[PDB]
Design an enzyme around this catalytic site. Structure first.
Site, mmCIF file in Angstrom:
data_model
loop_
_atom_site.group_PDB
_atom_site.id
_atom_site.type_symbol
_atom_site.label_atom_id
_atom_site.label_comp_id
_atom_site.label_asym_id
_atom_site.label_seq_id
_atom_site.Cartn_x
_atom_site.Cartn_y
_atom_site.Cartn_z
ATOM 1 N N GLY A 1 22.726 32.616 -19.582
ATOM 2 C CA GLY A 1 21.635 33.194 -20.344
ATOM 3 C C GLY A 1 21.883 34.699 -20.410
ATOM 4 O O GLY A 1 22.939 35.156 -19.972
ATOM 5 N N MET B 1 20.895 38.960 -19.978
ATOM 6 C CA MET B 1 20.453 39.713 -18.788
ATOM 7 C C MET B 1 18.958 39.497 -18.572
ATOM 8 O O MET B 1 18.237 39.178 -19.527
ATOM 9 C CB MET B 1 20.804 41.191 -18.970
ATOM 10 N N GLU C 1 28.217 36.323 -11.533
ATOM 11 C CA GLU C 1 28.881 37.156 -12.548
ATOM 12 C C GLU C 1 30.198 36.559 -13.014
ATOM 13 O O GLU C 1 31.221 37.264 -13.147
ATOM 14 C CB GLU C 1 29.105 38.580 -12.065
ATOM 15 N N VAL C 2 30.188 35.260 -13.307
ATOM 16 C CA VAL C 2 31.446 34.583 -13.611
ATOM 17 C C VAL C 2 32.132 35.098 -14.866
ATOM 18 O O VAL C 2 33.361 34.925 -15.036
ATOM 19 C CB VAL C 2 31.350 33.009 -13.603
ATOM 20 N N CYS D 1 9.169 42.064 -28.308
ATOM 21 C CA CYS D 1 7.952 41.328 -28.683
ATOM 22 C C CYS D 1 7.168 40.725 -27.527
ATOM 23 O O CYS D 1 6.074 40.176 -27.739
ATOM 24 C CB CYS D 1 8.269 40.264 -29.738
ATOM 25 N N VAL E 1 29.627 47.638 -16.908
ATOM 26 C CA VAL E 1 28.654 47.359 -15.863
ATOM 27 C C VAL E 1 27.450 48.300 -16.036
ATOM 28 O O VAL E 1 27.592 49.494 -16.324
ATOM 29 C CB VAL E 1 29.308 47.398 -14.461
ATOM 30 N N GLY E 2 26.260 47.746 -15.852
ATOM 31 C CA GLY E 2 25.037 48.536 -15.973
ATOM 32 C C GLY E 2 23.796 47.697 -15.915
ATOM 33 O O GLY E 2 23.870 46.448 -15.790
HETATM 34 MG MG LIG Z 1 22.782 38.596 -11.930
HETATM 35 ZN ZN LIG Z 2 11.432 39.389 -29.606
#
Ligand SMILES: [Mg+2]
Ligand SMILES: [Zn+2]
Ligand SMILES: [Mg+2]
Ligand SMILES: [Mg+2]
Ligand SMILES: [Mg+2]
Ligand SMILES: [Zn+2]
Ligand SMILES: [Zn+2]
Ligand SMILES: [Zn+2]
Lengths: 171, 173, 171, 173
Positions: D9, D11, D75-76, D134, D154-155
């Site tokens: 999915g 972040m 983090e695959v 939203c 990365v962040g």
């Molecule tokens: Mg994670």
């Molecule tokens: Zn939305």
């Protein structure tokens, strides 16, 4: 309409944890919520503030016109009038999430949870790790201390989660 | 132990279709099955397999053999609530049980036998139908359109439609 | 936006059956659909009429302004350009349902299915009954006749569904 | 055999939270676990457990013991695609594997390692986030709002937001 999600399973299965996860989803969305638990410790923790109430009829006071989700823990302890109160909320467009035990430690149904399972749009059966065999297959609660009574508030001092085969072995 | 799977939802939501899919799974595996339906106006067919037609849940026991691996019960709302204890005993004997039935009457009252089985279930599958009024895949209720007010009233599309909650509330007004 | 549902698993797992179930849902709702399969037998049967096409780019011709769902079988055989064609449909508000194999009989990934799994909103892994042990736990396809090639159209004359332990035993 | 569960999915969708829930399940059962994260800028924490920080997937083998029952990899998307064959070998040895990682980059291109693992998976769990624009629980994408166009970058919230498809398309216009 609102949708009803019922989260059920034995003790130690993460029901309250999941209910709180849904509360957080609504709060992150800046959607007003109302959180209830049956009766005075106002904390729902696995935490959020909850309204501690005796009867399902008492929820009306705390539900505002822009309330978007209603969250109810320990539903097995509420009066079965909770079924019509919840139906009315769904009819008004409000989502409802209920968590509670499906069965007593004697494998008798909790009436209020049963009624809400019949009304539910979604049912999430939760499992626990079996105290005896360690598999992720516990669907029952077994009482290990205290008396045989089916209403008995408590934790690890009185109850363990077991799978069906372990429950039958131990009995 | 055996596991209990309860498939529930309004009419037209594919409950018997799913129950039959599970019967096929067991048959493909050469696992003996026992299939039951209530006597109340022999095939279970979605549109199918032959079933034992029985009145009392306890009658299932006549047909369950030593090597029976799966028990399949359709229209559970019509069985006596003793079905809860009959099913528990089957699970304790290692027999998997699959039940299909309505959750709510057309008046939105619980079918008590289904409710008890939902309590016992290891897995619950809530099925949806296409709403007769709005066409969305969101129908969770059944509305009665002929035949008087009775909640025990066998029938099909001449008598009942599947609707979503908003549509049910609209049509009732 | 439209949502992408990808139905995957080994042979004999009911992928086409499930895809057709979704087609029926849309038709019952009087929602326009477009059904595709890769190339000339226009039947999708486990039946509905399908457009038999060589390339994913060819789907555009058959998609009308009020098309609500697009249904694609045997996606493992389409070019990986299917990923961008599907993304574009979702962007236009059209729901997409794809069925196809996840792995070859040698347990190598089908590239196109892999790409669609990454785009999916919902993934339904289907199981089959294991040809060897009879449990409902088959996640792999094993090739039992013909040559070792990974592209080889066929049914029970060449392929069985097995669980992982049975696959390893038989190999 | 072991089973492979892939949690994926955008972040902020609770992937590491779910991975950690599975680690706890195995630990409660007194089943030995091995937990891994990629070296690329020791704890796995959602907000947590300690993890072996490794570069190559094949490095996992140094830490997997005879009685290891579950392998958990966060983090695959950042691992070499050889992770597919390393995982297959673990499943063949009876070890359950749980992977969490992003499915798509912020440009909506597939993360190839995650895609290969989705192919191999016995169970796929697609996670959603709350859309930053939203507020609906419908975010399936990540949009980059700082740090240039790089897809390996990365962040956290200073760089990336979770959005639904409509909101992503709106913000990109
Ligand atoms: Mg994670
Ligand atoms: Zn939305
Ligand atoms: Mg609790
Ligand atoms: Mg039926
Ligand atoms: Mg097919
Ligand atoms: Zn046990
Ligand atoms: Zn409707
Ligand atoms: Zn097998």
């Amino acid at each position: 309409s609102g949708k009803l999600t019922v989260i059920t399973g034995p003790m130690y299965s993460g029901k309250t944890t999941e209910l709180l996860s849904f509360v957080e989803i609504y709060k992150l969305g800046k959607k007003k919520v109302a959180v209830f638990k049956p009766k005075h410790s106002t904390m729902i923790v696995s935490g959020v503030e909850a309204h501690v109430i005796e009867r399902p009829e008492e929820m009306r006071k705390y539900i505002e016109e822009d309330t978007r989700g209603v969250f109810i823990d320990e539903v097995q302890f509420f009066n079965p009038s909770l079924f019509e109160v919840v139906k009315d909320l769904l009819d008004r467009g409000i989502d409802v999430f209920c968590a509670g035990l499906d069965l007593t430690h004697k494998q008798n149904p909790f009436e209020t949870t049963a009624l809400l399972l019949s009304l539910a749009d979604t049912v999430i059966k939760k499992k626990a790790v079996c105290h005896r065999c360690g598999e992720y297959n516990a669907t029952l609660t077994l009482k290990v201390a205290g008396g045989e009574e089916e209403i008995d508030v408590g934790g690890q001092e009185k109850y363990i989660a077991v799978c069906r085969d372990c429950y039958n072995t131990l009995k």
